């Protein structure tokens, strides 16, 4: 009865496509669900050298890889969580949940 | 024994134990985020893995 959605996705508005369907898709059965909590973003920072060998002006890469985390708590019996989360997915979002 | 002598070197640590998981050379290795990947092959598959130049 105390359930917790783990929304971890790489693309930004791909995570919007799921975190819109976890309110608009859930309120149709009348459950007072919690709101999507903005967890802070994580920029995985890599600076490699552009050059394969070691000749040229020291020109560095800056390969940022942003990750975006949300959580939505659920006032739900977990039978209904197997219904909503098994429907309407895209590969961008990894669909995970903390149970109790 | 030759079995005793042919692989007598510990590979518990050092920069000759781990290698590039594409090249199998022991240089420019990204140990960060468990990549085990040489800086050139990382640069090749950066777009493919998920990394991208923005800054």
């Amino acid at each position: 009865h105390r359930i917790r959605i783990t929304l971890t996705s790489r693309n930004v508005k791909s995570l919007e496509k799921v975190c819109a369907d976890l309110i608009r898709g859930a309120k149709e059965k009348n459950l007072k669900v919690k709101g999507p909590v903005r967890m802070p973003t994580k920029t995985l920072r890599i600076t490699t050298r552009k050059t394969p060998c070691g000749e040229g002006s020291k020109t560095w890469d800056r390969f940022q890889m942003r990750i975006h985390k949300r959580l939505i708590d659920l006032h739900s019996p977990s039978e209904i969580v197997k219904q909503i989360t098994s429907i309407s997915i895209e590969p961008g979002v990894e669909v995970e949940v903390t149970i109790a | 024994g030759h079995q005793q002598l042919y692989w007598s070197h510990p590979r518990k640590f050092g920069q000759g134990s781990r290698s590039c998981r594409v090249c199998s050379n022991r240089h420019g290795l990204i140990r960060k985020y468990g990549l085990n990947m040489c800086r050139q092959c990382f640069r090749q598959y950066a777009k493919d893995i998920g990394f991208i130049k923005l800054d």
Partner: peptide, 19 residues
């Protein structure tokens, strides 16, 4: 997972599966 790898190793090590 039991050994329970992090979400900084999820998008990187499952990123290697795309490669």
């Amino acid at each position: 997972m039991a050994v329970q790898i992090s979400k900084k190793r999820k998008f990187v090590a499952d990123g290697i599966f795309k490669a």
